[PDB]
Design an enzyme around this catalytic site. Structure first.
Site, PDB file in Angstrom:
ATOM      1  N   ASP A 187       0.495   0.458   6.618  1.00  0.00           N
ATOM      2  CA  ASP A 187       0.813   1.707   5.967  1.00  0.00           C
ATOM      3  C   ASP A 187      -0.365   2.637   5.897  1.00  0.00           C
ATOM      4  O   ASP A 187      -1.227   2.540   5.049  1.00  0.00           O
ATOM      5  CB  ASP A 187       1.296   1.387   4.562  1.00  0.00           C
ATOM      6  CG  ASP A 187       1.947   2.566   3.888  1.00  0.00           C
ATOM      7  OD1 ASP A 187       1.668   3.709   4.249  1.00  0.00           O
ATOM      8  OD2 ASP A 187       2.753   2.339   2.994  1.00  0.00           O
ATOM      9  N   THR A 188      -0.343   3.641   6.744  1.00  0.00           N
ATOM     10  CA  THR A 188      -1.463   4.574   6.739  1.00  0.00           C
ATOM     11  C   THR A 188      -1.558   5.507   5.549  1.00  0.00           C
ATOM     12  O   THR A 188      -2.565   6.137   5.272  1.00  0.00           O
ATOM     13  CB  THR A 188      -1.454   5.303   8.102  1.00  0.00           C
ATOM     14  OG1 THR A 188      -0.221   6.013   8.347  1.00  0.00           O
ATOM     15  CG2 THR A 188      -1.658   4.278   9.225  1.00  0.00           C
ATOM     16  N   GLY A 189      -0.448   5.579   4.820  1.00  0.00           N
ATOM     17  CA  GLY A 189      -0.467   6.484   3.678  1.00  0.00           C
ATOM     18  C   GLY A 189      -0.978   5.896   2.395  1.00  0.00           C
ATOM     19  O   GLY A 189      -1.080   6.567   1.381  1.00  0.00           O
TER      20      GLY A 189
HETATM   21  O1  LIG Z   1      11.600   7.340   3.054  1.00  0.00           O
HETATM   22  C1  LIG Z   1      11.155   6.869   2.017  1.00  0.00           C
HETATM   23  N1  LIG Z   1      11.869   6.086   1.197  1.00  0.00           N
HETATM   24  C2  LIG Z   1      13.290   5.774   1.370  1.00  0.00           C
HETATM   25  N2  LIG Z   1      14.080   5.221   0.431  1.00  0.00           N
HETATM   26  C3  LIG Z   1      15.348   4.969   0.895  1.00  0.00           C
HETATM   27  C4  LIG Z   1      15.588   5.331   2.237  1.00  0.00           C
HETATM   28  S1  LIG Z   1      14.139   5.983   2.806  1.00  0.00           S
HETATM   29  C5  LIG Z   1       9.782   7.124   1.495  1.00  0.00           C
HETATM   30  C6  LIG Z   1       9.080   8.266   1.927  1.00  0.00           C
HETATM   31  C7  LIG Z   1       7.767   8.486   1.477  1.00  0.00           C
HETATM   32  C8  LIG Z   1       7.159   7.562   0.609  1.00  0.00           C
HETATM   33  C9  LIG Z   1       7.867   6.421   0.165  1.00  0.00           C
HETATM   34  C10 LIG Z   1       7.268   5.442  -0.810  1.00  0.00           C
HETATM   35  N3  LIG Z   1       5.885   5.013  -0.569  1.00  0.00           N
HETATM   36  C11 LIG Z   1       5.049   5.044  -1.625  1.00  0.00           C
HETATM   37  O2  LIG Z   1       5.531   5.099  -2.747  1.00  0.00           O
HETATM   38  N4  LIG Z   1       3.707   5.035  -1.521  1.00  0.00           N
HETATM   39  C12 LIG Z   1       2.974   4.695  -2.747  1.00  0.00           C
HETATM   40  C13 LIG Z   1       1.883   3.684  -2.604  1.00  0.00           C
HETATM   41  C14 LIG Z   1       2.044   2.491  -1.855  1.00  0.00           C
HETATM   42  C15 LIG Z   1       0.969   1.594  -1.684  1.00  0.00           C
HETATM   43  C16 LIG Z   1      -0.274   1.887  -2.275  1.00  0.00           C
HETATM   44  C17 LIG Z   1      -0.421   3.074  -3.040  1.00  0.00           C
HETATM   45  C18 LIG Z   1      -1.731   3.394  -3.671  1.00  0.00           C
HETATM   46  O3  LIG Z   1      -2.797   3.022  -3.218  1.00  0.00           O
HETATM   47  N5  LIG Z   1      -1.649   4.145  -4.774  1.00  0.00           N
HETATM   48  C19 LIG Z   1      -2.845   4.535  -5.514  1.00  0.00           C
HETATM   49  N6  LIG Z   1      -2.850   5.243  -6.653  1.00  0.00           N
HETATM   50  C20 LIG Z   1      -4.113   5.382  -7.167  1.00  0.00           C
HETATM   51  C21 LIG Z   1      -5.150   4.780  -6.424  1.00  0.00           C
HETATM   52  S2  LIG Z   1      -4.411   4.065  -5.090  1.00  0.00           S
HETATM   53  C22 LIG Z   1       0.662   3.964  -3.207  1.00  0.00           C
HETATM   54  C23 LIG Z   1       2.938   5.563  -0.360  1.00  0.00           C
HETATM   55  C24 LIG Z   1       3.086   7.115  -0.230  1.00  0.00           C
HETATM   56  C25 LIG Z   1       2.596   7.937  -1.419  1.00  0.00           C
HETATM   57  C26 LIG Z   1       1.211   8.113  -1.638  1.00  0.00           C
HETATM   58  C27 LIG Z   1       0.774   8.823  -2.773  1.00  0.00           C
HETATM   59  C28 LIG Z   1       1.706   9.366  -3.672  1.00  0.00           C
HETATM   60  C29 LIG Z   1       3.083   9.203  -3.452  1.00  0.00           C
HETATM   61  C30 LIG Z   1       3.524   8.485  -2.325  1.00  0.00           C
HETATM   62  C31 LIG Z   1       3.090   4.823   0.950  1.00  0.00           C
HETATM   63  O4  LIG Z   1       2.055   5.304   1.759  1.00  0.00           O
HETATM   64  C32 LIG Z   1       4.451   5.123   1.543  1.00  0.00           C
HETATM   65  O5  LIG Z   1       4.515   4.679   2.881  1.00  0.00           O
HETATM   66  C33 LIG Z   1       5.567   4.453   0.748  1.00  0.00           C
HETATM   67  C34 LIG Z   1       5.521   2.917   0.570  1.00  0.00           C
HETATM   68  C35 LIG Z   1       6.910   2.351   0.290  1.00  0.00           C
HETATM   69  C36 LIG Z   1       7.870   2.287   1.337  1.00  0.00           C
HETATM   70  C37 LIG Z   1       9.169   1.810   1.066  1.00  0.00           C
HETATM   71  C38 LIG Z   1       9.509   1.404  -0.247  1.00  0.00           C
HETATM   72  C39 LIG Z   1       8.562   1.461  -1.286  1.00  0.00           C
HETATM   73  C40 LIG Z   1       7.261   1.928  -1.017  1.00  0.00           C
HETATM   74  C41 LIG Z   1       9.178   6.205   0.610  1.00  0.00           C
END
Ligand SMILES: O=C(Nc1nccs1)c1cccc(CN2C(=O)N(Cc3cccc(C(=O)Nc4nccs4)c3)[C@H](Cc3ccccc3)[C@H](O)[C@@H](O)[C@H]2Cc2ccccc2)c1
EC number: 3.4.23.16
Lengths: 99, 99
Positions: B25-27
């Site tokens: 996961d690059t995001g």
């Molecule tokens: O299409 C999607 N969903 C669908 N549902 C039904 C059909 S399609 C969808 C689209 C975009 C994002 C996601 C949901 N999503 C996230 O919530 N996170 C939070 C995340 C994940 C992992 C780590 C962190 C992290 O490090 N957070 C931190 N906070 C403070 C310090 S670090 C954060 C980030 C993106 C993000 C970053 C910052 C703020 C907000 C979000 C990931 O990079 C995303 O790929 C993804 C991961 C994921 C995928 C499927 C189910 C659950 C979780 C889902």
């Protein structure tokens, strides 16, 4: 271009006549964009992520130019902290993950 | 190896003597794994995701094999629905994003 992951991969996108900055996101199935105005019609939808589900408006088929590359597909607009380009558009600009 | 993104980019990891699959996961700045049995002890942290914020255990200095490749890093364990490996480990296995 090749992009290393020492920093968030953000690209510039232009959507709807507006320029935005967006994260390139291989875990995301869908592109989700912070609230902005699009012309036209949309459908209500919900997606989940870490944290929860959000209700979102599904617009398709929106033209987006991402870096130089034009693509057309579904974008969802809603209460995301960041603009996310998910795999539905990443395939369209030919993006691979390589290790 | 080179992954295209028509499917979710899943890999096998070995973590704590246990075999799992995770999403590249690059995001995601941080690697977050579903709750599991890890030895050693930890600190509470919260991270934010798309539907809000989740509270997790932070273990540092964890050995992970991700595909063939060993990395050592910080792992958060907690209420995710998938195991995500994020940029802190991605950078160690030398992952590039390419378009
Ligand atoms: O299409 C999607 N969903 C669908 N549902 C039904 C059909 S399609 C969808 C689209 C975009 C994002 C996601 C949901 N999503 C996230 O919530 N996170 C939070 C995340 C994940 C992992 C780590 C962190 C992290 O490090 N957070 C931190 N906070 C403070 C310090 S670090 C954060 C980030 C993106 C993000 C970053 C910052 C703020 C907000 C979000 C990931 O990079 C995303 O790929 C993804 C991961 C994921 C995928 C499927 C189910 C659950 C979780 C889902």
């Amino acid at each position: 271009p090749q992009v290393t992951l020492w920093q968030r991969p953000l690209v510039t996108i232009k959507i709807g006549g507006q320029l935005k900055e967006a994260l390139l996101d291989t875990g995301a199935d869908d592109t989700v964009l912070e609230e902005m105005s699009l012309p036209g019609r949309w459908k209500p939808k919900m997606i989940g992520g870490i944290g929860g589900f959000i209700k979102v408006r599904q617009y398709d088929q929106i033209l987006i130019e991402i870096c130089g590359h034009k693509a057309i597909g579904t974008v969802l607009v809603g209460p995301t902290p960041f603009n996310i380009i998910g795999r539905n558009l990443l395939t369209q600009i030919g993006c691979t993950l390589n290790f």
